[PDB]
Amino acid sequence: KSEKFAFQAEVNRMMKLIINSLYKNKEIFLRELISNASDALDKIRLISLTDENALAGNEELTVKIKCDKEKNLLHVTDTGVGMTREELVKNLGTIAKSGTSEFLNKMTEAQEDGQSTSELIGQFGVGFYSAFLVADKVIVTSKHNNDTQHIWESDSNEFSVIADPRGNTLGRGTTITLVLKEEASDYLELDTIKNLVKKYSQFINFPIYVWSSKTKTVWDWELMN
Ligand SMILES: CCNC(=O)[C@H]1O[C@@H](n2cnc3c(N)ncnc32)[C@H](O)[C@@H]1O
Numbered sequence: 001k002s003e004k005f006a007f008q009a010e011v012n013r014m015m016k017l018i019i020n021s022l023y024k025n026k027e028i029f030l031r032e033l034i035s036n037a038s039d040a041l042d043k044i045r046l047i048s049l050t051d052e053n054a055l056a057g058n059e060e061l062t063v064k065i066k067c068d069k070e071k072n073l074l075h076v077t078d079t080g081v082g083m084t085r086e087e088l089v090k091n092l093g094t095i096a097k098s099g100t101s102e103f104l105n106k107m108t109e110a111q112e113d114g115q116s117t118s119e120l121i122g123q124f125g126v127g128f129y130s131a132f133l134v135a136d137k138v139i140v141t142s143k144h145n146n147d148t149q150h151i152w153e154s155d156s157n158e159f160s161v162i163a164d165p166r167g168n169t170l171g172r173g174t175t176i177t178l179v180l181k182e183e184a185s186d187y188l189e190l191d192t193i194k195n196l197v198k199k200y201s202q203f204i205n206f207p208i209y210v211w212s213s214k215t216k217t218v219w220d221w222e223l224m225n
Contacts, residue, residue, distance in 0.1 A: 002162045007154075008094045010104060015129045015156060017107050021117040022130050026184075028118055029134055030193075031200040032127020033076045033176050037063045038204040039125065040080025040174060045205075047081065057145060058171030063208040064221065065197055069188040072180055074135075078206075079173035082144035088152040088161050092128065092140065099124050128176075132156050134187060135178035143170040197224045 007015075022028050041061050048054040055061075058079045066075045083091060090096045095104075103124035110117050121127045131138045140152040141164060149164040178187075186192050190212050201208040201224055209221035 004160045026133040029130040037078035041206045044081040066211040067188045074178045077175040083142040084144045084147035085150045134184040137179035139177040142174040
């Protein structure tokens with residue numbers, strides 16, 4: 001039902017490099033989660049060219065962001081390809097792609113030579129770990145067409161993966177839930193999050209929404225572009 005894992009050594013080192021690189025630009029974490037969601041949406045859209053039923057578990061192709069100020073949570077949900085249990089373990093817990101190894105060598109060279117590094121993080125798609133700049137715990141709930149829904153969770157010191165006891169609630173796709181640091185509570189504010197989401201989202205080929213209020217209060221999904 002449940003299983004605990006240590007991170008691969010190189011992933012611990014990569015996390016520290018990323019955190020050091022972006023320590024004074026922490027808002028880039030949201031750029032990278034949005035970019036990752038965009039990639040996951042691109043992937044299932046490409047898969048849909050080859051598999052007529054690829055979207056049958058969730059017909060939308062969106063990114064949806066919600067702030068839960070009362071629970072201290074930020075959620076970034078996409079209806080992209082999702083991850084199987086094995087992918088949650090390998091993709092987040094190990095150096096899974098050859099590009100990740102290249103990123104590490106290029107990152108170390110740049111950081112010792114004074115070349116800019118945030119572009120490298122974005123280029124190699126390794127920005128997931130920058131979520132630990134703002135979060136004490138990162139939770140990934142994911143549903144892939146080839147597996148049941150699973151939850152990955154980590155405070156950076158280990159991670160675990162469990163089958164989701166709620167069953168298939170996503171249909172298809174992934175939620176990144178951040179348990180924010182006390183110092184990061186501004187990311188629970190709708191005005192902060194709407195501005196950042198609007199930044200960072202002008203290049204995605206999918207609509208991105210924020211759950212927002214008007215105020216008498218009506219809540220709905222606000223398209224950010
Ligand atoms: C460097 C950390 N590794 C990843 O972020 C990998 O995790 C998977 N991943 C990250 N975010 C998502 C997401 N929103 N949907 C699907 N896969 C994801 C992709 O395979 C990424 O390349």
